Design a protein around this ligand. Structure first.
Ligand SMILES: [Zn+2]
Lengths: 191, 287, 139
């Protein structure tokens, strides 16, 4: 089947409980993690899935393991503190990819971004140059917005996305009362 | 049909793990597994050694859990321990280091994969703290009874293998059960780290703390040991007053096993602490 | 060492490797490299073998061979002939005395044992040439 590692980064800021969008969509994207981890489990049960947030003091909630029975429990007690942290959020997983058991598992990291990015374009091109340098599959998922959706993140992805053939895809969700599961499951990354 | 001269390399890892495992070597039967790498035919090196949980059955093939063994071995494979198992060890308290029928049966069953199958039995219960001499065991082929027992070359090290010369176990059960020599190895990092670590383990923190303690205890506590030392000195001189009579009568042969000389030399050595520490007080007072 | 006092390299190598049998016993086979037979050489020509017979100032029975069990005051001349010179002790090199009636005599006075040649003093017929052996255990 498919031998690859899955890393998800969820936001724990207070920007995920606003009443305009879904009713505390944290549970909705939790069900998204559930359907992508159970979908990858149905495709290849040997894939390991890690859990970590993007707070100031990043904490590894669950080590990379195919056993999601305790991951379902670890998805709770999100500790809604902090706002956003991007640099050590990338470096806390992309550098931790070397701690996986199976060396044949490809590198794939996703992230749920629910807060505006605090890093300037220089950090975007330095981190995009680092991720394109080490050649890690990066899927950017941006939930919620305050300013325009993609102004510098467009060039961030275009400069970050190498290997144009069957490479990485960008997930941009527009506002809407519909669920996010079917909207993020539309690309080829899910399934 | 070929045999060589093998020798088991023993580092301080397996040694200290067999010493902590010997401290945990309760009368109940215990289990352990040795790891390492096979580079050639006649050498074997052990690096990784861990313990196993005890069971009411004791040493047996049923107590060895293959999912637990393979689980811990896999957790060692995901870490920086890419070594395969090389043997299993245990403890035989009281009844001697020899191997019973169950031990030779689980050894026969565990030797199907590894042709060497190194077996070590540690027994620190009745062994004195002066020597920690340990011996490794081997299994001989039952079909070699017609030919020579052990066609092992380099018969020089057998003199070093003759140190366990108990007159009941080695040749009391030597039939179908022999042993192998053991050597050690120590690099410069273990030599300087463990050497300076032991010297520091016998030294002080700043190394200047407990010096003045004795330099100034020479005036308070050692004075009692000096007066008692003079009490033993006079307590021998009261007999040394009678010695020149016998020495003035017989002069032939010695009947008293006491020398009366080296003990007083040792008393002088304990008395020279005042002289050696007087310069220390001179340095502390000076600067 | 040699006769001139210099030491032989394959003798020292052979004896040290001979002492190296402790770690590896088959290494003792290099002892044959240190075997130095003690004898004399009176070979005059490369293809002609003469016969030199000297005499010793000691007793011949004292220099005989210690013949073991079966288990089923001066000699007239030495036993070295056709030169088959036998063993000779280094202390025996001072008691040898060449005969004055010997037909042949080298140019150098034979004082100590070693490798020397023979000088034809007569330079006449009857050099007493002896034949060579034949095929067998050797070539
Ligand atoms: Zn027992």
């Amino acid at each position: 089947m498919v031998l690859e590692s899955t890393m998800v980064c969820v936001d724990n800021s207070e920007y995920m409980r606003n009443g305009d969008f879904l009713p505390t969509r944290l549970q909705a994207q939790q069900d998204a993690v559930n359907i992508v981890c159970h979908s990858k489990t149905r495709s290849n049960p040997e894939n390991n899935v890690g859990l970590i947030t993007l707070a100031n003091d990043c904490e590894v909630l669950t080590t990379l393991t195919p056993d999601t029975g305790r991951i379902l429990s670890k998805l709770h007690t999100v500790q809604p503190k902090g706002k956003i942290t991007f640099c050590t959020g990338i470096r806390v997983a992309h550098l931790a990819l070397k701690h996986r058991q199976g060396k044949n598992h490809k590198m794939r990291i996703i992230a749920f971004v629910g807060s505006p990015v605090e890093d300037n374009e220089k950090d975007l091109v330095k981190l995009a140059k680092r991720l394109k340098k080490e050649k890690v599959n990066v899927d950017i998922i941006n939930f919620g917005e305050e300013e325009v959706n993609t102004e510098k993140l467009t060039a961030f992805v275009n400069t970050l996305n190498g290997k144009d053939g069957t490479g990485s895809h960008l997930v941009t969700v527009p506002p809407g009362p519909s669920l996010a599961d079917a909207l993020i499951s539309s690309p080829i990354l899910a399934g | 049909a070929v045999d060589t001269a093998e020798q088991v390399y023993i580092s301080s890892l397996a040694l200290l793990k067999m010493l902590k495992h010997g401290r945990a070597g309760v009368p109940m039967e215990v289990m352990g597994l040795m790891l390492g790498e096979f580079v050639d035919d006649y050498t074997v090196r052990v690096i990784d050694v861990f313990a196993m949980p005890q069971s009411g059955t004791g040493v047996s093939v049923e107590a060895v859990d293959p999912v637990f063994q393979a689980k811990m071995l896999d957790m060692l494979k995901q870490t920086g321990r890419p070594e395969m198992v090389v043997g299993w060890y245990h403890s035989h308290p009281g009844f001697g280091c020899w191997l019973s029928g169950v031990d030779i049966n689980t050894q026969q069953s565990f030797e199907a994969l590894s042709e060497r199958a190194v077996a070590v039995v540690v027994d620190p219960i009745q062994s004195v703290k002066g020597k920690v001499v340990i011996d490794a065991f081997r299994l001989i082929n039952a079909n070699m009874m017609v030919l020579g027992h052990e066609p092992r070359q380099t018969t020089s090290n057998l003199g070093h293998l003759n140190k366990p010369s108990i007159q009941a176990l080695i040749h009391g059960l030597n039939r179908h059960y022999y042993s192998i020599t053991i050597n050690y190895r120590k690099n410069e990092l273990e030599q300087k780290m463990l050497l300076n670590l032991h010297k520091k383990s016998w030294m002080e923190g700043l190394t200047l703390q407990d010096y003045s303690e004795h330099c100034k205890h020479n005036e308070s506590v050692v004075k009692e040991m000096l007066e008692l030392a003079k009490n033993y000195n006079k307590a021998v001189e009261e007999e040394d007053k009678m010695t020149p009579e016998q020495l003035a009568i017989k002069n032939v042969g010695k009947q008293d096993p006491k020398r009366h000389l080296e003990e007083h030399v040792d008393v002088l050595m304990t008395s020279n602490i005042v002289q050696c520490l007087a310069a220390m007080l001179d340095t502390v007072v000076f600067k | 060492q040699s006769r001139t006092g210099h030491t032989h390299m394959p003798s020292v190598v052979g004896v040290l490797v001979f002492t190296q049998f402790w770690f590896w016993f088959p290494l003792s086979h290099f002892l044959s490299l240190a075997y130095t037979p003690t004898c004399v050489i009176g070979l005059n020509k490369d293809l002609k073998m003469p016969k030199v017979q000297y005499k010793s100032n000691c007793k011949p029975s004292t220099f005989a061979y210690p013949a073991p069990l079966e288990v089923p005051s001066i000699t007239a001349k030495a036993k070295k002939k056709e030169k088959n010179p036998a063993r000779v002790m280094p202390a025996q090199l001072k008691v040898l005395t060449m005969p004055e009636t010997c037909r042949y005599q080298p140019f150098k006075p034979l004082s100590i044992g070693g490798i020397i040649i023979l000088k034809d003093t007569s330079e006449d017929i009857e050099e007493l040439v002896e034949p060579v052996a034949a095929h067998g255990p050797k070539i």
